[PDB]
Design a protein around this ligand. Structure first.
Ligand SMILES: CCCCCCCCCCCCCCCCCC(=O)OC[C@H](COP(=O)([O-])OCC(O)COP(=O)([O-])OC[C@@H](COC(=O)CCCCCCCCCCCCCCCCC)OC(=O)CCCCCCCCCCCCCCCCC)OC(=O)CCCCCCCCCCCCCCCCC
Ligand SMILES: CCCCCCCC/C=C\CCCCCCCC(=O)O[C@H](COC(=O)CCCCCCC/C=C/CCCCCCCC)COP(=O)(O)OCCN
Ligand code: SF4
Ligand code: SF4
Ligand code: SF4
Ligand code: SF4
Ligand code: FES
Ligand SMILES: [Mg+2]
Ligand SMILES: [Zn+2]
Lengths: 230, 208, 97, 376, 48, 96, 125, 115, 112, 176
């Protein structure tokens, strides 16, 4: 019908018009590395971790934002894609603090896992690191802003899902920061979710702080009784 | 690719592939699949009924001469209808080579004992029976070898719990060692280590 | 060492060898229990350029085993697993104990 | 029983003192090691191989490390391989001393044990200096070795190695030409070459019967292709020939150790690949990637690509093997351990036909049995 | 110390007869050595 | 910072002392209760705050490779001091 | 030779499990939920069988976590739900199955962030 | 159909015959076991226990499962006769140090949470 | 002539050429009863014919041992007897027939 | 490349025969063995005067565990739980919470010394050198309970052995 045929690593698949490269790769069961893309938030394209090579194209495209074109051949494991991921991980880790033993994200960190899976194993960064002051946005969400990778997921969630425009970015370039710019409590009935969507330990649970690590926990799938939504 | 990557050997790979083709052509009645692993190990997947012929051929053929049984064991894969995978490892001194022979069975289907082909199997088959519960037909003396006298169940099976079902202690009232249901002062702590991001693209499975 | 020579002579005669030459107790020829600090050379991957991990990734070069003769799918000279082993040589150093 | 060599219950049927039947009952040291390994990561499972055969610790570590390195498609650095071969030969010396002296002690010659256990003590000191433990070192790791040699270890290994041959000579003076020892060992437990091959025997139990097979020569690993040594071969398949084979193997191990001392190269000790081998602590405390990789390697461990291998080495007691099955994660799916003592003890009943009680004791001694590897 | 003794017999301690509160004229053990002399005595270092 | 409970038992740095009706105190009768006397929270509270003339300072706990991983502390907030998350040392800029 | 057995498969009397842990147990057959703290989906590919949670108490000494449940740690991995069901049925365990939950396909559009008249326009970027 | 391969018996009649033979052997062995192991039970208790163990598996309808059960019982008999077993192993069948666990609802409700 | 084969339980063979010829003739005779299109028959016939030609063409035992690559002609005799026994067994087994059964679809699928 | 250990033939000459007859009748090799034991009788024994004399050890030696501090007296441990994750024996039990001053510290840190295999993996895994295996090995107890170490016992071990532990670390950290 209106489906168009595209190839992921030389394999044919039929996709709806306007489907992004990331979703087409997901159709064959391949997950493109990401930091800023969330399928329930608006597309940002800022992290640049999802860059992939299209066959017979010199420039890598951002898979999370670029719509697939008919007859395209994505190449998710080519040398160009791997080197793009390695470079982007390198830039992400350049200013990141050596906080894993004290970070609550420790065993649940998308940054850690994607560094292990797609990045290099070494640092060639020989400068000093940037450090930023902490923000206080209430008693529920602990804030350690140095860890922020500037994904902007928190800003998009608060604006679009929660309906609040309290979060934003001040400054520009290296000094750009995520916050409220004033002493404000990000208080809302859906606020705690910004802990889940934040990929790093920049936003963590204050009640949960330091108590457990993810590998020791046992998971019981259950239902909530705090209201009638279930 | 040089210093930290394990080097390849294509000559041995070719020789093993050709010999696997040889074995498959000679015994089509039983050979279901032949594989050569990336680090040059040859495996032959057969039908259970051909355990005794295949091994006998592999021991007596002039071009085979695998006169030594290095190991025999079982692997439990509960998702398969035939739960147990029987693995024979053979070494040829004349040709300085190794071969692996694999077959399958389930809980209620016996496998032919291969004590006649190899004397070494005796204790290996007893061990497989003890740990996994796979019966071997026409075995000279099949009984438990590793587990305690009167021990119920097979420990190596995936379903069996790590600490089992009973423990032992000395009881003074009956003046002897008694077996009781296991109680643990500290429970073994189960860790969930598997990363949610895929590690090896070459092994990705189709999305069903 | 400590033992008087006549005892050393009796020891040598009974054993048949000069015992003093190869004493089994370490008197003073062993290394000091305090040493200078080391320096330890870095590995080959400690380069600052031309070191992309994708070119030295041994784990990612492993592949599933190569399939020969799936059942589900000329003279043809007979083949062997590997050439026959060469016969061993008899130890030009000391062939017979 | 002192002659039992561990927790072995041997049930014997006897007519007078003649042995009509041997029924070895084992499992008194079965600890369920393989299931436990299935519950560990690949680094957490390594200290189990120390405790399989407690007289050849680093050899078991090396076999397991070779299996895991083959499954990882990586390569240990050359200095690590030389260290591995050097300590494997030291370990072979340890094992052969233990075997020969405990065999003599069963027979009744109690003295050589005390002479050789001081040497064993000096080698335990070598173990301790390198790893901090005299026995279960856990030094050999799937990436190389844990730490580099301390700054004066080679000199002391040289000093020990240049005196050991005289101790072997004193042992041979005690035993080799004694008519009592020959009466207790010659023509006892004779096994034919074909029987040895069929029953699954390996190592000395083959070489005493004239079979020319040594895994270091036929299927070399690490840097064994770069060292020179002879392989002792027997003629009669009895206990005397196997005793002579073990003594000459001790001498050849001294030869290999001298070569390894004079040929140790410089360089790093583990594979320069921080997704498999942990980084140095200074890097771990300065670099973000190094800290991330340290964290992940010590919590989750490295993942091993799916596949199964059978890796075998020439351990001092025979062919020691691992059948290792990886399902793609950081925990082994299956680990079957092949120990030569299993087959040797399964053949003990065959080797004791037409012999007395004391001859059976000698045969148990000559098979070189440790029940940690037999039962697992 | 006596460096002319073989390694092992070249360093030794004559214990005190009166430790914290107990009489140690006969009852001595290796745990009475304090950590610094413990390091010297077990030949972990050459420097007292 | 040791202190005894109303039962005469020492209270640990953790703050756990057996309750009056808790039978488990019987495990200490005819023996003693192990309590470490050097309270870390008190000892770190005695260290003087380091004054540095930069917005961002670095801490590695001293000793180089013998300390902790090196971290960078921002010192822009003047109402508080920058505290190391590893060692507990405090830093500030020259104020007032 | 084949004998044509007619009955359902049943191996309980051979497994050696005490009858208490055969009749009073309930297993759950399910595809585990994705951990919401991460975006990877690699832990949501296979089916899992796990037993019901039993009592855990406090050790009088040291206050460790004690259990008397021998199956408190056992987790089985299956390719398909049918294999898990067959295993549970032949082992004699009562089971509860849950159908696999997949995320629905979502229509993404970067340009929608800058709609001329739509509500989708982003107030920030 | 169902395409299965037997172990020893082709139908339930042969399996029952083997069960009866094994039962005869255990019945004959019980007095010797009581004598050799110096057990404080009677021969009547031992034969009652043998019958109870046999009746534990009375519901089996698969000849292959019955064949495996007979193989295991023969393994246990061989083990008992040769004295591989000790008195503790024989007495493990009687659970002499196990306090009786109740089966009614109220007692279970009183003791704890397990059903 | 030669003493001490060197392997325990392997006696020295007097007249090994005659023994080898008899054994190879028996092997070919047994192979003659196998269907001509069976791979086992043609492979074993080819190797046996080469070995028989080598035995017929070389009167010297050590030179024949070096040609045969079989390790000490007594072992060659033993291997010939092994091949004869295997040939009789294969005649009884008939492994050249079509595959007996096909395994389940996911039986050899790994991982899981 | 191989050699024979028992393939030597005896000389059949009259002189050789008479020497072997003398060996058989006058027991010469037995006197050789007696001479070897007599030689060892006059050597110095390799025995050491324990507890006065101790066996040599190394800075890398793994002994009783200890929890260390920074020079300020603040504990080094930050409750990352890497030691608990890596421990092959599951001998370490850790519970943590924010301290009164917000610090990330442990409230429970136990090592079951009868579970421990003394492998030293925990001190390798520790990122701040908080848990160590100290040099001590003479800590036999009379009861099993005394070998179940809590945080107080391990902190006391650190306080008691810090002087030697720091000197051992200084001598070995450049190999780590
Ligand atoms: C019968 C004749 C006994 C002669 C004798 O005992 O002297 C052996 C003395 C032992 O020499 P060594 O122990 O081989 O050499 C190392 C020095 O003795 C190392 O000597 P040292 O520095 O250890 O000397 C310590 C000193 C003190 O030693 C003691 O007090 C402990 C032994 C006391 C025994 C009472 O030794 C003695 O003076 C006692 C010698 C024997 C007395 C009994 O040498 C001889 O006199 C040879 C005599 C004939 C030997 C056959
Ligand atoms: C003019 C006419 C003169 C008359 C003739 C006089 C000359 C006689 C010459 C021959 C005398 C020889 C006497 C020795 C008797 C025993 C010799 C012998 O053959 O015994 C040995 C074995 O005897 C032993 O070796 C004993 C073994 C146990 C040894 C225990 C300790 C060794 C002795 C220590 C020193 C002995 C000191 C004794 C004197 C003490 C002072 C009273 C034989 O055994 P096999 O070697 O196995 O061979 C035979 C079967 N094929
Ligand atoms: S957010 Fe992740 S990478 Fe950053 S410190 Fe925490 S665990 Fe480490
Ligand atoms: S706090 Fe977290 S979600 Fe918000 S921008 Fe930073 S990394 Fe993204
Ligand atoms: S030494 Fe090993 S077993 Fe002991 S606590 Fe540390 S990691 Fe665990
Ligand atoms: S001792 Fe070290 S590894 Fe263990 S929790 Fe404390 S800081 Fe982490
Ligand atoms: S995921 Fe595409 S740019 Fe971030
Ligand atoms: Mg977060
Ligand atoms: Zn600090």
């Amino acid at each position: 019908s209106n489906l168009i045929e595209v190839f992921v690593d030389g394999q044919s698949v039929m996709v709806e018009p306007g489907t992004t490269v990331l979703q087409a790769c997901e159709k064959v069961g391949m997950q493109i590395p990401r930091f800023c893309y969330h399928e329930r938030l608006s597309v940002a394209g800022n992290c640049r971790m999802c860059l992939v090579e299209i066959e017979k194209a010199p420039k890598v495209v951002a898979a999370c934002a670029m719509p697939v074109m008919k007859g395209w051949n994505i190449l998710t494991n080519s040398e160009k894609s791997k080197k793009a991921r390695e470079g982007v991980m390198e830039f992400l880790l350049a200013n990141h603090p050596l906080d894993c033993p004290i970070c609550d994200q420790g065993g649940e960190c998308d940054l850690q896992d994607q560094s292990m899976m797609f990045g290099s194993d070494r640092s060639r960064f020989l400068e000093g690191k940037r450090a930023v002051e902490d923000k206080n946005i209430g008693p529920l969400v602990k804030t350690i802003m140095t860890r922020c990778i500037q994904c902007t997921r928190c800003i998009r969630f608060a604006s679009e899902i929660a309906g609040v425009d309290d979060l934003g970015t001040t400054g520009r370039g290296n000094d750009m920061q995520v916050g409220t710019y004033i002493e404000k409590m990000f208080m809302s009935e859906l606020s705690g979710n910004i802990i889940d969507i934040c990929p790093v330990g920049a936003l963590t649970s204050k009640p949960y702080a330091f108590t457990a690590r993810p590998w020791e926990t046992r998971k019981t799938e259950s239902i909530d009784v705090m209201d009638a939504v279930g | 690719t040089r210093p930290t990557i394990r080097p390849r050997n294509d000559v041995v790979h070719k020789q093993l592939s050709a010999f696997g083709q040889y074995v498959a052509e000679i015994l089509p009645k039983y050979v279901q699949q032949v594989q050569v692993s990336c680090f040059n190990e040859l495996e032959i997947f057969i039908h259970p009924d051909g355990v005794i012929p295949v091994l006998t051929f592999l021991r007596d053929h002039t071009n085979a001469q695998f006169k030594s049984l290095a190991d025999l064991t079982a692997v439990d894969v509960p998702t398969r209808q035939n739960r147990f995978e029987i693995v024979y490892n053979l070494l040829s001194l004349r040709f300085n080579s190794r071969i692996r022979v694999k077959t399958y069975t389930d809980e209620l289907t016996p496998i032919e004992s291969s004590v006649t082909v190899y004397k070494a199997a005796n204790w290996y088959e007893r061990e497989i029976w003890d740990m996994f519960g796979v019966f071997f037909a026409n075995h000279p003396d099949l009984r438990r070898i590793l587990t305690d006298y009167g021990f119920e169940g097979h420990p190596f099976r995936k379903d069996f719990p790590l600490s089992g079902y009973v423990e032992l202690r000395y009881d003074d009232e009956v003046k002897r060692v008694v077996a009781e249901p296991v109680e643990l002062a500290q429970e073994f702590r189960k860790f969930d280590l598997n990363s949610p991001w895929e590690a090896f693209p070459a092994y990705r499975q189709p999305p069903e | 060492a400590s033992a008087t020579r006549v005892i050393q002579l009796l020891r040598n005669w009974a054993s048949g060898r000069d015992l003093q030459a190869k004493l089994q107790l370490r008197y003073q020829e062993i290394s000091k229990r305090t040493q200078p600090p080391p320096k330890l050379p870095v590995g080959p991957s400690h380069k600052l350029s031309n070191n992309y991990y994708c070119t030295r990734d041994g784990r990612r070069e492993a592949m599933p085993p190569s399939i020969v003769m799936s059942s589900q799918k000329t003279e043809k000279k007979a083949v062997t697993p590997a050439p026959p082993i060469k016969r061993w040589e008899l130890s030009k150093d000391q062939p017979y104990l | 029983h002192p002659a039992a060599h561990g927790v072995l219950r041997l049930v014997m049927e006897l007519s007078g003192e003649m042995v009509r039947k041997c029924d070895p009952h084992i499992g008194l040291l079965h600890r369920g090691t393989e299931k436990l390994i299935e519950y560990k990561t690949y680094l957490q499972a390594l200290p189990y191989f120390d405790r399989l055969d407690y007289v050849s610790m680093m050899c078991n570590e090396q076999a397991y490390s070779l299996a895991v390195e083959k499954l990882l498609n990586i390569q240990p650095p050359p200095r690590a391989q030389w260290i591995r071969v050097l300590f494997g030969e030291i370990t072979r010396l340890l094992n052969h001393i233990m075997a020969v002296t405990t065999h003599a002690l069963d027979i009744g010659a109690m003295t050589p044990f005390f002479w050789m256990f001081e040497e064993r003590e000096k080698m335990f000191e070598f173990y301790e200096r390198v790893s901090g433990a005299r026995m279960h070192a856990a030094y050999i790791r799937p990436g190389g070795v844990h730490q580099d040699l301390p700054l004066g270890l080679l000199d002391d290994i040289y000093e020990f190695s240049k005196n050991f041959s005289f101790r072997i000579d004193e042992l041979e003076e005690m035993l080799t030409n004694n008519r009592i020892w020959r009466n207790r060992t010659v023509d006892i437990g004779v096994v034919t070459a074909e029987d040895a091959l069929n029953y699954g025997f390996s190592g000395v139990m083959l070489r005493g019967s004239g079979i020319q097979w040594d895994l270091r020569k036929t299927q070399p690993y690490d840097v064994y292709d770069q060292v020179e040594f002879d392989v002792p071969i027997g003629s009669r398949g009895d206990c005397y020939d196997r005793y002579l084979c073990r003594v000459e193997e001790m001498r050849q191990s001294l030869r290999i150790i001298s070569q390894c001392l004079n040929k140790m190269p410089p360089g790093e000790i583990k594979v320069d690949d921080a997704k498999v081998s942990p980084p140095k602590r200074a890097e771990m405390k300065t670099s973000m990637e190094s800290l991330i990789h340290h964290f992940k390697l010590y919590t989750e461990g490295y993942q091993v690509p799916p596949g199964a291998t059978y890796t075998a080495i020439e351990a001092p007691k025979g062919e020691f093997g691992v059948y290792l099955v990886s399902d793609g994660s950081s925990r082994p799916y299956r680990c079957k351990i092949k120990a030569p003592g299993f087959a040797h003890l399964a053949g003990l009943d065959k080797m004791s036909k037409g012999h007395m009680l004391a001859d059976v004791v000698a045969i148990i001694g000559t098979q070189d049995i440790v029940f940690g590897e037999v039962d697992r | 110390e006596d460096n002319k003794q073989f390694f092992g017999r070249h360093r030794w301690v004559i214990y005190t007869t009166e430790m914290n509160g107990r009489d140690t004229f006969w009852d001595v053990d290796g745990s009475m050595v304090p950590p610094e002399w413990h390091r010297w005595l077990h030949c972990m270092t050459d420097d007292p | 910072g040791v202190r005894t409970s109303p039962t005469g038992e020492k209270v640990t740095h953790t703050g756990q002392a057996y309750d009056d009706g808790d039978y488990r105190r019987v495990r200490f009768s005819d023996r003693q209760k192990e309590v470490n006397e050097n309270f870390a929270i008190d000892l770190i509270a005695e260290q003087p705050v380091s004054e540095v003339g930069s917005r961002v300072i670095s801490c590695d706990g001293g000793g180089g490779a013998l300390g902790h991983p090196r971290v960078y502390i921002n010192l822009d907030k003047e109402t508080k001091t920058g505290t190391c998350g590893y060692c507990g040392l405090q830093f500030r800029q020259p104020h007032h | 030779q084949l004998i044509a057995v007619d009955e359902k498969l049943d191996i309980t009397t051979l497994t050696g499990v005490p009858e208490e842990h055969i009749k009073t147990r309930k297993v759950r057959i399910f595809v585990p939920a994705r951990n919401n703290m991460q975006s990877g989906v690699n832990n949501t590919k296979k089916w899992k069988m796990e037993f019901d949670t039993r009592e855990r108490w406090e050790n009088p000494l040291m206050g460790w976590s004690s259990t008397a449940d021998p199956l408190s740690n056992l987790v089985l991995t299956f390719s398909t739900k049918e294999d898990a069901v067959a295993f549970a049925e032949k082992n004699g365990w009562s089971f509860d199955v849950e159908e696999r939950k997949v995320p629905k396909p979502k229509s993404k559009s970067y340009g929608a962030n800058f709609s001329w008249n739509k509500r989708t326009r982003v107030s920030t970027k | 159909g169902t395409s299965v391969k037997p172990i020893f018996s082709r139908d339930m009649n042969e399996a029952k015959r083997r069960v009866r033979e094994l039962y005869r052997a255990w019945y004959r062995e019980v007095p010797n076991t009581v004598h050799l192991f110096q057990l404080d039970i009677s021969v009547k208790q031992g034969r009652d226990k043998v019958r109870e163990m046999f009746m534990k598996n009375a519901h089996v309808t698969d000849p292959r499962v019955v064949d495996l059960l007979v193989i295991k019982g023969k393994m246990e008999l061989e083990e008992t006769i040769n004295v591989w077993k000790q008195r503790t192993h024989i007495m493990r069948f009687f659970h002499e140090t196990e306090a009786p666990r109740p089966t009614d609802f109220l007692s279970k409700f009183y003791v704890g949470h397990d059903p | 002539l030669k003493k001490t084969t060197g392997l325990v339980g392997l006696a020295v063979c007097e007249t090994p050429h005659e023994r080898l010829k008899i054994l190879y003739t028996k092997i070919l005779d047994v192979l003659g009863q196998i269907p001509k299109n069976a791979a086992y028959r043609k492979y074993t016939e080819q190797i046996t014919n080469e070995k028989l030609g080598m035995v017929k063409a070389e009167p010297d035992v050590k030179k024949l041992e070096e040609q045969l690559q079989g390790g000490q002609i007594e072992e060659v005799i033993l291997q010939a007897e092994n091949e004869l026994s295997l040939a009789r067994k294969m005649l009884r087994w008939k492994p050249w027939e079509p595959l007996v059964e096909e395994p389940p679809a996911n039986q050899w699928k790994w991982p899981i | 490349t191989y050699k024979f250990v028992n393939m030597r033939e005896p000389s059949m000459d009259m002189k050789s025969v008479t020497d072997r007859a003398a060996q058989t009748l006058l027991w010469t090799e037995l006197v050789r063995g007696l001479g070897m034991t007599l030689s060892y009788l006059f050597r110095e024994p390799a025995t050491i005067n324990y507890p006065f004399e101790k066996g040599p050890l190394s800075p890398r030696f793994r002994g009783e565990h200890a929890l260390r501090r920074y020079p300020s007296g603040e504990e080094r441990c930050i409750a990352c739980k890497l030691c608990e994750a890596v421990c092959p024996a599951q001998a370490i039990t850790i519970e943590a919470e924010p301290r009164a001053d917000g610090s990330r510290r442990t409230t429970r840190y136990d090592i079951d010394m009868t579970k421990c295999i003394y492998c030293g993996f925990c001190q390798e895994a520790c990122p701040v050198d908080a848990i160590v295996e100290g040099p001590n090995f003479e800590f036999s107890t009379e009861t099993h309970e005394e070998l179940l170490y809590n945080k107080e016992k391990l902190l006391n071990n650190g306080d008691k052995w810090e002087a030697e532990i720091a000197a051992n670390i200084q001598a070995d950290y450049l190999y780590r």
